[PDB]
Design a protein around this ligand. Sequence first.
Ligand SMILES: *[C@H](/C=C/CC(=O)CCCC(=O)O)C/C=C\C/C=C\C/C=C\C/C=C\CC
Length: 256
Amino acid sequence: ESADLRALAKHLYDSYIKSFPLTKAKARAILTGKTTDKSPFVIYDMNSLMMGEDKIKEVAIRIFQGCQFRSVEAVQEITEYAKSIPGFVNLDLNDQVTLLKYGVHEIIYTMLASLMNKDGVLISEGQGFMTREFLKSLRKPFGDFMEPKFEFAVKFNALELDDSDLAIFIAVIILSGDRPGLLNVKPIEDIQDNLLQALELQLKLNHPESSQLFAKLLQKMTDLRQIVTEHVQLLQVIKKTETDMSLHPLLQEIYK
Ligand SMILES: *[C@H](/C=C/CC(=O)CCCC(=O)O)C/C=C\C/C=C\C/C=C\C/C=C\CC
């Protein structure tokens, strides 16, 4: 029954809206100028950055520490969303922890695309915007840490998914039966089979005129992995270059 599927879809959408305070729908209204009260302050160089701090320890480290604390905040939000996915909380405790460990970054990059256009990225709950060119001009190694998230986002945003599509997608990501070290793969695969079915219906109904959207979006999951791997390689370099800079405990266990 596709009705059971549309009900799963609506439940996931509703949890997503409750769990994440900056939706894609809000992010697009900020970025495309449906605003007199929604316009961001734009940071594109060093003075506007200082100006920024006032209207909202080198600079590359500050930005990077800022990104750290925002991923941790995202993790907490993703962790709340996951508990809402039917069956997730009934899984073995170890598998819950495994699924979140490998899933949280794929989800963060997916949702990050909603805050991006080819020119920059919304920051600080949409009150700021930081240009892609300013991010790329930071001292090495930090200079090109965001470049591949931007290249991902231009491609992924061309799919034109909205929040209700993303809610099912992100659920499909967490419920991955092939994560290393999973004790009990079958209960996961059954949850994910049901999600895949919901996603397939959602995309058919929400994008009737968009041939094979479902398959194209599943192929994107490969780009996400590639983003994670590069990013882990970049973290090993930072570890050795700055012995004074501190990864956040929550993030250190994820990566461990
Ligand atoms: C920050 C996003 C970085 C993503 C990463 O790859 C790093 C995450 C670490 C990890 O989980 O591996 C770039 C996006 C927006 C700008 C972020 C911060 C700019 C400065 C301030 C923003 C507002 C408040 C910061 C506390």
